[PDB]
Amino acid sequence: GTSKLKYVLQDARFFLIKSNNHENVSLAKAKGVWSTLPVNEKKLNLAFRSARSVILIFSVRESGKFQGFARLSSESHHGGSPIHWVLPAGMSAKMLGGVFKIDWICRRELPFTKSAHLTNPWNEHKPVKIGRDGQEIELECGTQLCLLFPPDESIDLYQVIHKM
Numbered sequence: 001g002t003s004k005l006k007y008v009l010q011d012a013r014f015f016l017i018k019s020n021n022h023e024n025v026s027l028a029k030a031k032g033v034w035s036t037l038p039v040n041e042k043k044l045n046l047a048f049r050s051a052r053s054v055i056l057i058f059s060v061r062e063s064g065k066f067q068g069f070a071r072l073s074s075e076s077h078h079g080g081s082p083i084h085w086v087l088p089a090g091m092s093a094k095m096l097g098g099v100f101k102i103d104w105i106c107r108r109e110l111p112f113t114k115s116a117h118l119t120n121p122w123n124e125h126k127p128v129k130i131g132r133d134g135q136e137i138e139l140e141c142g143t144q145l146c147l148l149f150p151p152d153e154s155i156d157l158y159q160v161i162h163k164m
């Protein structure tokens with residue numbers, strides 16, 4: 001079913017994550033963490049305080065797909081055991097030093113061809129696949145985008161609901 005998923009997405013906020021490489025999304029899925037540039041770090045920390053759920057929706061650049069979505073379970077935190085991100089050019093380890101814990105809601109992929117009917121009012125009504133890293137996605141678009149993903153039957157949202 002999909003009722004707990006809908007409950008988690010109730011009045012959530014959604015942010016588009018654009019990763020320049022697959023390796024970091026794979027690491028994120030394994031280790032339950034994410035890091036972004038300081039400008040986005042600040043926005044996510046603010047939104048983590050503002051909403052029942054903050055949802056990250058991941059797409060690797062040039063893949064033509066989303067690779068899944070996850071819910072922030074913490075604010076960012078610096079200085080722990082370093083995450084071995086593959087660093088994009090011009091991006092230093094210090095720039096990515098803030099670590100968010102995340103709980104994955106879906107690790108299955110969705111091709112851009114299946115979301116062509118969803119546009120994002122916070123990005124000039126462009127298709128929701130289009131957007132810079134950190135672009136916020138409007139509630140109705142974001143909900144519908146998440147509900148398009150194939151079910152991830154490996155996930156139990158019972159714990160995530162307890163965190164809300």
Ligand SMILES: CNc1ncnc2c1ncn2C
Nearest residue numbers: 018019020021024035036133
């Ligand atoms: C682990 N964070 C990241 N990895 C790869 N690329 C990124 C990232 N953040 C923003 N961009 C463009």
